[PDB]
Amino acid sequence: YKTKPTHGIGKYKHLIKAEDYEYGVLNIHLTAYDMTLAESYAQYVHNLCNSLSIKVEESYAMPTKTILTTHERVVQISGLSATFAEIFLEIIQSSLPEGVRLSVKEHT
């Protein structure tokens, strides 16, 4: 009740959000000859991101292009610190299994 000390004890919408130099939106493009390898590396990089507490929005894929086929994957990233970005991409560089293509391209 409004006049009681327990007023607003049940409110939650303020606890739900429905909607210093730092990067913008980062897109990691992974084009690979192997569906299995692309999926495994996508899982690995997503696990690294969510272990290092990086805001990941999307992990979608581009449509296939034939001209054999190369499977494409996307990882979205937002929120990097100075040293954190360095460690992040050096780990990505050193943990690339075999003949895969990375990218740090931006949106649009």
Would you call 2 helix, strand, or coil by DSSP? coil
Amino acid at 36: T
Rounded Cα distance between 35 and 30, Å, is 11
> Which of 8/78 has CB closer to RNA?
78
Distance between CA atoms of residues 27 and 30, nearest Å: 10
| 42 or 80: CB nearest RNA | 42
Report the residue from 56, 85, 96, 102 that binds RNA according to the rule CB under 7 A: 56
Residue 56 or 92: the one with the smaller Cβ distance to another protein is 92
Task: Write down the least CB distance from residue 84 to RNA, Å.
Answer: 17
Q: Which of RNA, another protein, none sits in contact with 27, Cβ below 5 to 8 A by type?
A: none
Q: Going along 1-108, which residue ranges are E strands?
A: 26-32, 71-77
Measure the CA–CA gap between 72 and 27, rounded to whole angstroms: 12
Task: Give the footprint of RNA on this chain (CB under 7 A).
Answer: 39, 42-43, 46-47, 50-51, 56, 58-61, 73
